[PDB]
RNA sequence: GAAAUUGUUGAAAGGGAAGGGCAUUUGAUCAGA
RNA sequence: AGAACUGGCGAUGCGGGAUGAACCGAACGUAGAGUUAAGGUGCCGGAAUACACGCUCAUCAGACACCACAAAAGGUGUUAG
RNA sequence: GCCCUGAAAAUGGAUGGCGCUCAAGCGUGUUACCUAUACUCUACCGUCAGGGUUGAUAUGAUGCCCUGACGAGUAGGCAGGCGUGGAGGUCAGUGACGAAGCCUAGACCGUAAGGUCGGGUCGAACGGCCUCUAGUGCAGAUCUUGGUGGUAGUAGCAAAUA
RNA sequence: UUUGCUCCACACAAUAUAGAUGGAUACGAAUAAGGCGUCCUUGUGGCGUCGCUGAACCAUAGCAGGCUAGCAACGGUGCACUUGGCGGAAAGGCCUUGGGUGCUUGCUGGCGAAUUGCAAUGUCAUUUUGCGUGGGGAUAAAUCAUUUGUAUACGACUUAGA
């Protein structure tokens, strides 16, 4: 729904006299802020366990920063989404420097290719593929060849002015 | 509803308007295509 | 726009002067207006209010 | 020299308006060489003259002036809002105005 | 910045060019468009011919001389786009349209004047490579414009004359750049360089 | 010389002309409120004439003040005029339309003697 | 001796109505200190 | 065509939906300044030919709810699974 | 998913138009920006409410003043005002040195109904204020009477031999 | 033609301005390619260089730009003349020759400016028209009426008439 941050959200299923110290369930939620993070936490906990916001509590919320924000990684992403006619599971691969950037790319890509809005997508799993040759999508694999170089043909520079006096060039 | 019997329309719509010509001498509106190998000659003549 | 919880520009519904044009009654009302304002006397306030009352609200005693 | 100009050229674009209602009290001015509101902040407050010519000589001249000033930037492209003592006629949409360098804070 | 801006319409994406020119006209700038026959429309030539035929079938049913006129010349097709994007029924729009001239080719007054382009309307900068596009001269010829050949002949003549002019200008520019190459190590040139010139 | 006053603000200087008094001669300009069920003017559609309303009321401080800052007092004679002797900075005398020329001369002379301003001193003058 | 309606003179405007609202240019005209 | 609850129109202008009683926004004394709503920012037209990732080429492309329509069934078109 | 086939209607026409194809299209995300009679602040008008002030020169205590809030509106109700014919009182009001009436892209006051003034015309009466009274206010009613247009110098004024 | 018409120059008047305020500053083609320079074996050639916007280039100092004295160099630039050429798409412009004349800020001096009072477009442009003063130039038609019938409701058309 915006530029994403990843939050660990831990909730409780609030204690009673019968059950003190309940079982402290945790989730990694990609959300643009903490209100949405906690909302998504309760949404998925209600999908998983007999609990709701009114019968539980948020024990903790903590943003998780990328441990290595400046190393390029290949992420495998497993999602579950609703199409116009059904629900489907999908696996994709995204090359980027952080989980939040990978997830933002994934949401953009789901919207672009499957018209799957945010509300229709569940992030099942995001995991860095530590070993290349376990990358199984060609659109990522092509970026892992040795000494990868490519030109950027047909450069289009934007003019600051309405009129130009030169009949410009697209060389690069 | 439809005409109920087909006939061709009366008159030619390509000769409109049925107005008075602007001159008593009708204008030549197209001359023969020039063939520039032939000798010089008039493409038309005036008579009565 | 305001969601008014009550009628706007509602008049209090109480007389603030006698309907009468009796000049002497108006003089009495002036006197008891002064008194009710500058005595803190409940009697003066209620007499000032009673001086406004119509005839059927002033039954004979 | 050949040039004597101490004003920045501008164009009276239009009045302040919505789609179907204009506001003659506020004019929109395109200042030459200004492409951002950041640049237009410099000209905020500068005096503006619309200078025009009339047939009838009045007080020793056939040139008349409508004075105003820049009030704020407009949009994202350097256009500014301006208010004049008397609103501009609206026949001047596209006419040239002069944005002087005073009041100066340089 | 100029009193008259002359746009070389060659390869200029007629709709985007018309947007630029309409805004300039309404802002108060005089615009002269040349080489309207070299303008481009995005989409296949057949697409644009079918579009113009859909335009051509529209006409006032009871009197075709009242209906929308279908001007075939490339300059007038560009003018149609531009007029549709100007409020042409007002006096302001009439003044704006009077500030405009469109031409096929480059007629004598403007053949010796500077021509500019509009990068935000240029086909090579705007269209994705591989996308098909139409040339206005070909579209106009297909829909009844009679003067593509004459314009091409006059343009070939003008380009011969202009290439001769440019050969002379390039020779003179080489002379000037050589005389500027010397006196580049002079004290005045070094002070100029210190000041950025 | 009138009493100092704040700048006089007329909230609406143009007349409130009755709807369609420009369209029909039988419809006089004297303001009338449209009572019609479909009346575009009564319904206050954009583009139509404005109607008189209390919001247009003028500042009580400057109400009834002529541009010179005096309130007009109609005078028919020297006695009416002399009702303004102690109020020359607040009221200005206007000679009544039906006063004869010689009585106007008398009134003007007395107003000049008393420093009372006359708003129409050039009425029925020597022609 | 009103208006409808009309003549003349004067002023002004006028590409398939005219009239109107807000604002200002221009012309004419005018009160106030 | 007929009921239920609410909100409206009628009785209501204003900004938006080109246009429109009812939709969206917001309800109205006369003004000034600022900020916004809904809706928009190529040009008409005030406002980025803004920034970013993709998808689409239609010899009937598509282009914002109410709303001014399209279905079953199909396509080594192309994309992702 | 998008695109295409499926996909046929009658005047010529509608993403509003132009036009737009790494869009000015579709899905999505981020900012900046535009502007309503809405919101915020201020001024002014009015309404309502709560108050202050008869201690004097002080004539508007229905007054003066302070404070806050509010203002859509058919049918309809009520209030405060404007105007007309006539009546009691008053201004010892206006007037043949010109009353009333009428005309006047001239001026002023009032939010308005209206009021006032100047100029022209005119000729015998008329007005302000406090009250009284009503045959008291017109755009309509295929309204009534009278007058006048555009149509329009138009239709036409051509049977009965000349 | 009750001294008409037109063209040039000048003065005086009006008349307005869709909007000057240093310069519209000219290859063509391509853009998954080009420009420029240079070289040769003249090509779809070799080498070098540039772009990454005109943020450029040119111009630009002087009572809105006065009056003078020099130095340096034979440059720049305005002007009226003058030589030859090219340009028809709307040419109405581009180039070029020679002499004259003015300026030159390329460099160095001398004098002036004030009081428009602390700003007020503080008037410097071009568009038509009229009139006057000089000078050059030209010395008709059309319509009505009559007539024709290749025409025709009327206009119109087509004809004839010193
Ligand atoms: K009328
Ligand atoms: Mg049939
Ligand atoms: Mg044809
Ligand atoms: Mg008024
Ligand atoms: Mg209704
Ligand atoms: Mg008579
Ligand atoms: Mg009349
Ligand atoms: Mg009803
Ligand atoms: Mg409503
Ligand atoms: Mg719609
Ligand atoms: Mg705009
Ligand atoms: Mg299907
Ligand atoms: Mg389809
Ligand atoms: Mg749009
Ligand atoms: Mg988008
Ligand atoms: Mg307001
Ligand atoms: Mg009270
Ligand atoms: Mg109300
Ligand atoms: Mg009676
Ligand atoms: Mg009289
Ligand atoms: Mg009149
Ligand atoms: Mg008599
Ligand atoms: Mg009656
Ligand atoms: Mg009547
Ligand atoms: Mg009625
Ligand atoms: Mg009738
Ligand atoms: Mg009758
Ligand atoms: Mg007849
Ligand atoms: Mg007959
Ligand atoms: Mg007979």
Question: Which domains can be identified in chain D, with CATH numbers?
Answer: 1-106 (2.40.10.190)
Long-range (24+ apart) CB contacts under 8 A made by D15-24 are: D15/D87, D15/D90, D16/D81, D21/F46, D24/D87, D24/D88, D24/D90
* Cβ distance of A163 and E117 shorter than 8 Å: yes
| A142 and A74 fall within a common domain | yes
Q: How close does chain E come to A31, measured CA to CA in Å? A: 35
Question: Residue F50: inside a domain, yes or no?
Answer: yes
How many beta carbons lie within 10 A of that of residue A172, not counting itself?
10
Asked if residue A12 keeps its beta carbon closer than 7 A to nucleic acid strand I, the reply is: no
Question: Residue A15: inside a domain, yes or no?
Answer: yes
Q: What's the token pair of residue E154? A: 């006059």
Asked if residue F6 keeps its beta carbon closer than 7 A to nucleic acid strand I, the reply is: no
Question: Residue A101: inside a domain, yes or no?
Answer: yes
Q: What is the CA radius of gyration of chain A?
A: 22
Tell me how far apart the alpha carbons of residues A116 and A83 are, in angstroms, rounded to a whole number.
7
Number of domains in chain F: 1
Q: What's the token pair of residue E85? A: 């994007």
What does the DSSP assignment read for A101-153?
A: HHHHHHHHHHHHHH---GGGEEEEEEEE--STT----HHHHGGGSTT------
Given E20, E114, E125, which is nearest A162 (Cβ)?
Answer: E20
Range of the domain at F74: 6-127
Number of domains in chain A: 2
Question: Residue A156: inside a domain, yes or no?
Answer: no
Chains in contact with C, counting 3 or more C-beta pairs less than 8 Å apart as contact: none
Tell me how far apart the alpha carbons of residues A103 and A4 are, in angstroms, rounded to a whole number.
8
Cα separations in angstroms, A114 against A85, A106, A110 = 12, 11, 5
Domains belonging to chain E, first-starting first, are 1-147 (3.90.1180.10), 148-197 (1.20.5.4280)
Question: Residue F95: inside a domain, yes or no?
Answer: yes
Asked if residue E102 keeps its beta carbon closer than 7 A to nucleic acid strand I, the reply is: no
Query: Hey, which residues does E41 pair with through a beta bridge?
Result: E134
**Residue A77, burial from CB neighbour count under 10 angstroms (0-12, 13-18, 19+):** buried
Tell me how far apart the alpha carbons of residues F87 and D95 are, in angstroms, rounded to a whole number.
54
Provide the phi-psi class of A92: left if phi over 0, else alpha when psi is between -120 and 50, else beta.
Answer: beta
Provide the phi-psi class of D69: left if phi over 0, else alpha when psi is between -120 and 50, else beta.
Answer: beta
Question: Residue A96: inside a domain, yes or no?
Answer: yes
| Resolution of the experimentally solved model in angstroms | 2.0
| A76 and A136 fall within a common domain | yes
- What strands, in cross-sheet order, belong to the sheet with E30-34? E4-8, E30-34, E100-102
- Closest C-alpha to E95, from A110, C19, D95, C50: D95
Question: Residue A118: inside a domain, yes or no?
Answer: yes
| A25 and A39 fall within a common domain | yes
Question: Residue F1: inside a domain, yes or no?
Answer: no
**Which residues make Cβ contacts (< 8 Å) with residue A93, sequence separation at least 6?**
A74, A75, A76, A77, A129, A135, A136, A137, A139, A140
CB distance E8 to E117 below 8 Å: yes
According to the 3-state scheme, what is the secondary structure of A50-75? CCCHHHCCEEEEEECCCCCCCCCEEE
| A64 and A116 fall within a common domain | no
Contact residues, chain E, for D13 at CB < 8 Å: 27
Tell me how far apart the alpha carbons of residues E196 and A28 are, in angstroms, rounded to a whole number.
57
* Cβ distance of A164 and E118 shorter than 8 Å: yes
* Cβ distance of E117 and A162 shorter than 8 Å: no
**Which residues make Cβ contacts (< 8 Å) with residue E84, sequence separation at least 6?**
none
| A59 and A92 fall within a common domain | no
Tell me how far apart the alpha carbons of residues A73 and A96 are, in angstroms, rounded to a whole number.
6
Query: Hey, which residues does A123 pair with through a beta bridge?
Result: A79
| A24 and A74 fall within a common domain | no
Provide the phi-psi class of E91: left if phi over 0, else alpha when psi is between -120 and 50, else beta.
Answer: alpha
What does the DSSP assignment read for F38-77?
A: T-TTTTT-TTS-----GGGPPPTTTTTB-TTSPEEEEESS
Q: What's the token pair of residue D9? A: 């050229």
Which of A24, A44, A69 lies at the terminal end of a domain, its last residue? Answer: A69
Tell me how far apart the alpha carbons of residues E25 and A100 are, in angstroms, rounded to a whole number.
48
Given E1, E28, E96, which is nearest D95 (Cβ)?
Answer: E28
Per DSSP, helices labelled H in chain C are 23-39, 42-50
| A82 and A111 fall within a common domain | yes
**Residue A20, burial from CB neighbour count under 10 angstroms (0-12, 13-18, 19+):** exposed
Between strands A87-96 and D22-31, the pairing is unpaired
Cα separations in angstroms, E146 against E64, E92, F28 = 21, 33, 64
Tell me how far apart the alpha carbons of residues C39 and F67 are, in angstroms, rounded to a whole number.
48
| A41 and A82 fall within a common domain | no
Cα separations in angstroms, D74 against D40, D71, D82, F23 = 9, 10, 10, 42
Question: Residue A164: inside a domain, yes or no?
Answer: no
Return the residue matching tokens 């700038």: E29
Contact residues, chain A, for E117 at CB < 8 Å: 163-168
What does the DSSP assignment read for D21-57?
A: -EEEEEEEEEETT--SHHHHHHHTT-EEEEEEE-SS-
Maximum Cα–Cα distance for chain A, whole Å? 83
Return residues 109-168 of A near E (CB < 8 Å). 154, 156-159, 162-168
| A94 and A107 fall within a common domain | yes
Tell me how far apart the alpha carbons of residues E99 and E79 are, in angstroms, rounded to a whole number.
12
Range of the domain at A50: 3-69
**Residue E47, burial from CB neighbour count under 10 angstroms (0-12, 13-18, 19+):** middle
| A74 and A63 fall within a common domain | no
């Amino acid at each position: 729904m915006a530029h994403f941050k990843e939050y660990q959200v831990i909730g409780r299923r609030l204690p009673t006299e019968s059950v003190p110290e309940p079982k402290l369930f945790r989730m990694r939620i990609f959300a643009s802020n903490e209100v949405i993070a906690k909302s998504r936490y309760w949404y998925f906990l209600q999908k998983l366990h007999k609990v709701k916001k009114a019968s539980g509590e948020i024990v903790s919320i903590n943003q998780i920063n990328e441990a290595h924000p400046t190393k390029v990684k290949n992420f495998g992403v497993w999602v579950r989404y609703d199409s116009r006619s059904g629900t489907h599971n999908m696996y994709k691969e995204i090359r980027d420097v952080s989980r939040v950037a990978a997830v933002e790319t994934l949401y953009q890509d789901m919207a672009a290719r499957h018209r799957a809005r945010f509300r229709s997508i569940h992030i099942l799993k995001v995991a860095e593929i530590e070993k290349t040759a376990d990358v199984k999508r060609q659109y990522v694999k092509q970026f892992l060849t040795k000494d990868l170089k490519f030109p950027l043909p047909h450069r289009v520079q934007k003019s600051t002015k309405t009129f130009s006096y030169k009949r410009p060039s697209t060389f690069y | 509803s439809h005409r109920k019997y087909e006939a061709p329309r009366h008159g030619h719509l390509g000769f409109l308007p049925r107005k008075r010509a602007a001159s008593i001498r009708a204008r030549v509106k197209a001359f023969p295509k020039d063939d520039r190998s032939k000798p010089v000659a008039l493409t038309s003549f005036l008579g009565y | 726009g305001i969601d008014h919880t009550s009628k706007q520009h509602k008049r209090s519904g109480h007389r603030t002067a006698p309907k009468s044009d009796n000049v002497y009654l108006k003089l009495l009302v002036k006197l008891y207006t002064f008194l009710a304002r500058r005595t803190d006397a409940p009697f003066n306030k209620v007499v000032l209010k009673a001086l406004f009352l119509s005839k059927i609200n002033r039954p004979p005693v | 020299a050949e040039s004597h100009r101490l004003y920045v050229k501008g164009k009276h674009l239009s009045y302040q308006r919505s789609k179907r209602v204009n506001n003659p009290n506020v004019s929109l001015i395109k200042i030459e060489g200004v492409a951002t509101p950041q640049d237009a902040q410099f000209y905020l407050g500068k005096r503006i003259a619309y200078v025009y010519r009339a047939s009838k000589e009045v007080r020793g001249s056939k040139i008349r002036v409508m004075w105003g000033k820049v009030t704020r930037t407009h949009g994202n492209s350097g256009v500014v809002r301006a208010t004049f003592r008397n609103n501009l006629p609206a026949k001047t949409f596209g006419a040239s105005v002069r944005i002087f360098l005073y009041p100066s804070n340089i | 910045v100029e009193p008259v801006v002359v746009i070389d319409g060659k390869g200029h994406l007629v709709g985007r060019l018309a947007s630029v020119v309409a805004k300039q006209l309404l802002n108060g700038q005089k615009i002269v468009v040349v080489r309207a026959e070299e303008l481009n429309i995005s989409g296949e030539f057949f697409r644009n011919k079918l579009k113009y035929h859909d335009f051509l079938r529209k006409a006032t049913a009871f009197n075709k001389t009242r209906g929308p006129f279908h001007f075939r010349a490339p300059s007038r097709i560009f003018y149609k786009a531009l007029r549709g994007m100007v409020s042409h029924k007002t006096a302001r729009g009439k003044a704006a349209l009077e500030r405009l001239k469109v031409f096929e080719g480059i007629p004598p007054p403007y053949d010796k004047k500077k021509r500019v382009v509009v990068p935000q309307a240029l086909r090579v900068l705007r269209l994705k490579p591989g996308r098909k596009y139409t040339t206005l001269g070909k579209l106009s010829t297909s829909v009844g414009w009679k003067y593509e050949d004459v314009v091409a002949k006059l343009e070939a003549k003008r380009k011969v004359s202009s290439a001769e002019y440019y050969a002379k200008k390039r020779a003179f520019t080489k002379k000037v750049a050589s005389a500027n190459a010397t006196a580049a190590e002079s004290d005045v040139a070094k002070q100029l360089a210190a000041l950025g010139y | 010389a009138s009493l100092p006053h704040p700048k006089i603000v007329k909230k609406h200087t143009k007349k409130f002309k009755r709807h369609h008094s420009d369209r029909y001669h039988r419809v006089a300009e004297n303001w009338r409120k449209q009572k019609g069920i479909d009346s575009v003017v009564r319904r206050r559609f954009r583009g139509n004439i404005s109607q008189p309303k209390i919001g247009y009321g003028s500042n009580k401080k400057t109400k009834f003040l002529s541009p010179s800052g005096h309130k007009t007092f109609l005078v028919a004679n020297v006695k009416d005029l002399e009702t303004l002797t102690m109020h020359t900075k607040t009221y200005a005398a206007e000679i009544a339309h039906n006063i004869s020329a010689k009585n106007r001369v008398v009134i003007l002379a007395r107003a000049k003697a008393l420093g009372i301003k006359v708003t129409n001193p050039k009425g029925r003058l020597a022609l």
